[PDB]
């Protein structure tokens, strides 16, 4: 299995740069609105302790430089929604795809298009951790890069990049400007909560193994969801929700293995370990493939 | 530090579907030419042992159905270059990027745009293995998917997809239609030569691990180039040349770790194992980042 990103072209055509003073970052141009992190209005000194509402009072439409490449897009209005700025521009983007804004859950994967000065640099797949960080790859100038999924040519934007934590993981918002996790957009060292293993994705991995004939681990037992959840947490695994059980539905039907039967198999792996055995060639259980990712690859 | 592909937009605009009889696959549309695997002219019967010149002489321009999304492109000429078919069309692709065809060397990386029915599906990074296979992700209908690098707006196409070996690895050609490796476009079970590990790439990746605050595998030892190469070859690693040592220069300077000092770290990793420890989240020594890849991402 490869970590596979979606083709990035539909998002590349939406990337612009936004500058306010010498502060430059990336923006997302959809129809006649450009979305970007609101801290673009801050000076380095203001990022230490910002009052966004006051900083924005001193800004006008003509303080914002929006560029597609080197071509300036005239700003005709501005407003703030949570931690994102919305700049109304006088040109509707002809490359705007069909799109939606969605807020994802821990465990869901998405493609990140890393950008610098409005220019796309690379694309890779990330998973939202239970502690609401992603293990990204971002340098100075990457803020405003976005994460997305594509379903039948509709682009669902789910992430806009804001911050690197002292541990080197990354934090950001949805496209309505609401952070994932307890983080805030100020220049301070912030720490994430202890992370856990993404149980629903480990189960997807086990289904993937069964699909490919690697099924030694299937056991003879079963469990209730509540009993499994209580054991899972003693091993630093996320509890399952009803939504997790339902997104495992297609793989459960494909293999004939009930979701709760697979939970019982995983519970043995957790208690007894693997015993030098491997699954899909690895001694480690993988937790960054969603049930959808397994269906796409298999 | 993550496996990172090039943005695929410039390539997506070039992907089309090519159909001959009941055989369909993907093609690459640049200016007024569509490039695709030549076995699209074969009926599934044919693939068992094709005589390609003999089969192509018997086809007409109108046997080729080329679709760019919903629009049909009219084929007005065709020619064969090794394992690649070149269909001349009456329409120039307005989204043709600046491009070049290159043949890559083992150990080098490229981005793959996996396509089905002329529609792009996914993008990921691959390396050309020393045995000239690639460890990709390709299903039925993926033939004609391409691999590429991008350098300041210019797309260097280096791979066109043709085959999945029984072991699950993949094989293909350059855009002049010459296979990488000893493979042939006939429907047979084909084995590769014994693979080896790309040593310069593992070293580049260890430099990447240090830049992300993992220095655990480092040691106080040193080694000569030849003594390292003796141990490398014993572990089925490719030899490290002096040119490799020079390519590793910048990473050595940013970290202050001499190349042969890093070789001694790798020697210890090979001789003792990683002991249940992980490097950048991997339980295994990773060999599909080039020194260029590491610099581009870390800097
Ligand atoms: C943006 O590009 C800002 O425009 C930048 C992206 C990061 C730079 C390094 N890699 C990245 O992912 N984001 C920041 O610089 C943010 C700015 C905030 C939201 C105003 N700051 C941080 O990510 C940040 C600050 C501090 C810190 O201070 C004190 C101490 C430790 C970590 C840390 N991260
Ligand atoms: C193409 O899409 C063909 O148009 C297809 C891509 C592979 C299918 C599954 N995954 C892929 O990457 N390529 C093939 O089907 C090729 C066609 C040749 C070049 C004419 N054949 C194989 O990949 C192939 C044939 C055989 C085989 O025979 C008998 C036995 C074992 C493996 C095998 N692979």
Numbering used by the authors:
A (entry chain A): 3 to 300
B (entry chain B): 3 to 301
The authors write:
The main protease (M pro) of coronaviruses plays a key role in viral replication, thus serving as a hot target for drug design. M pro is able to process polyproteins to produce several nonstructural proteins (NSPs) necessary for viral replication. PF-00835231 is an inhibitor designed for the main protease of SARS-CoV that emerged in 2003, but its clinical trials were suspended due to the rapid disappearance of the SARS outbreak.
We then used the co-crystallization method to determine the crystal structures of several M pro mutants of SARS-CoV-2 in complex with PF-00835231. In each of these seven complex structures, each SARS-CoV-2 M pro mutant molecule appears as a dimer form, which is also the form with enzymatic activity. Our data showed that the binding mode of PF-00835231 is not significantly affected by these mutants. The results showed that PF-00835231 can effectively inhibit SARS-CoV-2 M pro and its mutants.
